[PDB]
Design a protein around this ligand. Structure first.
Ligand SMILES: Cc1ccc(C[C@@]2(C(=O)O)C[C@H]2c2ccccc2)cc1
Ligand SMILES: Cc1ccc(C[C@@]2(C(=O)O)C[C@H]2c2ccccc2)cc1
Ligand SMILES: *Cc1c(COP(=O)(O)O)cnc(C)c1O
Ligand SMILES: *Cc1c(COP(=O)(O)O)cnc(C)c1O
Ligand SMILES: [Co+2]
Lengths: 321, 318
């Protein structure tokens, strides 16, 4: 894309590189590095577009302050966009969110409201609702799991970049599902706008919280705890369009961690746990002869630098090592 | 640039965004965000090009391994490129190096050799030389402070990006100097290749180690300790072409840290200490009427996320 001066850092989102994996898999895995973003994750796109959309809809205007419950990369994305565009932001999250993330969020100007650790994200969602209810004219909740501006940005940026960078040669699209925006939006551009209805869209989820598989089977939703940060919220988000999914691959915590470590050591791509999960799903599909000659695009949501205090960098090296 | 599939992560360097600063300075500071790079710093460009250059020179034949003494972003850059392109890499550094940083380099496949803490960077340089001397056919030292492939990549990528993104309108170019490659290579492109000899090139350094100022004034070189990671090595590097510098601005530790905090809180640009230093220098220039109407391009070398254990994030809470 074209040379310019960006008017603020929110406008720099996307155009992330698509990199061939040469040592992991058969040479047809193409990794889309979504840590090449202004706050270093796929969420940069949705922090930008949910705020731009709120501006366009007339609900974010001078005097209105943003609120969102998030203990993750969405909080970081909303923080840098609010700072870049001159909005006040309040984030709610359980008091168990890491010091690294609190430091980042405060440095970017966010106002943090810490909720009881025992109540997890449910307690943070309740606190965000309470804050907005205290002054609904003042506060705007963005609602990342249902706000259509989330999948919209992937329809307008992420998907077009995959189509253009592969010159239409993509055959398989793999996305670990958190909010579902990435899966939904990219698939709507490729299957819908470009008419490629035989794209294979693969949802990735934790083996220990396989709610997408349960929903497609018409079974009871029964989530569980797991370590693949950023995916597997334990329900079907509003922003996940189940009708667009062709296959669901469940990944273990250990598979996700080990494959993220391989991205770093074998490909030089700093990668988070969910990036390992998505590439591990590509490797499982390449066990099946139907996939042997397909070009597989995989989203890598985050950089392993954000994971130094997590399982990803634990049980890896001995004191002596 | 042209839509494509990159054949490895080293080929994804550059095309970093130039962002107008709206609250910091007069609206004419244009910040080039060099953390938008495959290992998140300006050094990703030189990790790639020093290795590409070694390949082109025929000195990276099968069995040859890389060695470099580095405590910083160059070690992370060389590690991701060596992992991407299938080389073995040894980095030397003092044992002071944090366990978390050893884990990150380790995860990228680097072999670490930890040297005696009291001997600092000098001890790490000594150990790298000793490793190469133990088997010179096997080991290749990249020598980031003198290897011309460092400023070359900035002449071939960073410089052109600044020229294109500003439509040639860049009046002032500000770089905090570590190796000098950024300053040297960008200035060679803009003053030389593009012929814009009216460009004002500004070197930034710590007030507590003002060796560039000393060199340009013809004063004795007298370095000192400071906090501005990535700049101010306390000598004039081979890759710093002093002839290209118009002005040197010295920045305090506190000015660097406070201005980096403003980049984060006021602009939403995650920024390291040296990014704060370089922008602090732009602010000083904008106090001088001669600079008021000028477009000022400033390099932001790194992201504040790499500084979470440092004073950059101190006193954010009670
Ligand atoms: C540590 C961490 C990282 C990323 C996330 C992603 C999400 C966010 O708010 O940033 C979207 C939400 C999420 C929460 C739980 C499971 C999956 C996604 C959450 C927590
Ligand atoms: C902590 C840290 C960060 C960046 C650097 C930059 C350099 C590196 O090897 O990565 C170039 C070298 C350097 C060393 C001392 C002063 C300035 C630059 C060094 C140390
Ligand atoms: C958000 C996120 C995902 C999932 O992306 P969605 O578009 O929300 O499905 C995966 N990994 C990480 C690290 C994320 O932050
Ligand atoms: C390398 C580096 C610089 C200085 O860039 P040079 O091109 O080496 O002069 C500044 N800040 C940081 C953090 C760096 O890593
Ligand atoms: Co481009």
């Amino acid at each position: 894309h074209m040379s310019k001066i960006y008017e603020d850092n929110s406008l720099t989102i996307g155009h992330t590189p698509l990199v061939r994996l040469n040592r992991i898999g058969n040479g047809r895995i193409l990794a889309k590095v979504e840590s090449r973003n202004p706050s270093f994750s796929v969420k940069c796109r949705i922090g930008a577009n949910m705020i731009w959309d709120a501006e366009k809809r007339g609900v974010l205007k001078p005097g209105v302050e943003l609120v969102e419950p998030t203990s993750g990369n969405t909080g970081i994305a909303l923080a840098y966009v609010a700072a870049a565009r001159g909005y006040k932001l309040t984030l709610t999250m359980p008091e168990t969110m890491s010091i690294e993330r609190r430091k980042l969020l405060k440095a970017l100007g966010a106002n943090l409201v810490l909720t009881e650790g025992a109540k997890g994200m449910k307690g943070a969602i309740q606190k965000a609702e309470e804050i907005v209810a205290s002054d609904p004219q003042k506060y705007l909740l963005l609602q990342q799991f249902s706000n259509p501006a989330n999948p919209e940005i992937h329809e307008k940026t992420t998907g077009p970049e995959i189509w253009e960078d592969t010159d239409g040669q993509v055959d398989v699209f793999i996305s670990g599902v958190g909010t579902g925006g990435t899966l939904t939006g990219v698939t709507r551009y490729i299957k819908g706008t470009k008419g490629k209805t035989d794209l294979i869209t693969v949802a990735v989820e934790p083996t220990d919280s396989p709610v997408i598989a349960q929903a497609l089977a018409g079974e009871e939703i029964k989530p569980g705890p797991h370590k693949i940060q950023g995916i597997g919220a334990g329900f079907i988000p509003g922003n996940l369009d189940l009708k667009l999914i062709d296959k669901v691959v469940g990944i273990t915590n250990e598979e996700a961690i080990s494959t993220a470590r391989r991205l770093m050591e074998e490909e030089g791509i700093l990668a988070g746990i969910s990036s390992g999960a998505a590439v591990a799903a590509a490797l499982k599909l390449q066990e099946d002869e139907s996939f042997t000659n397909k070009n597989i695009v995989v989203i890598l949501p985050s950089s392993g630098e954000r994971y130094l205090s997590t399982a990803l960098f634990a049980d890896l090296f001995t004191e002596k090592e």
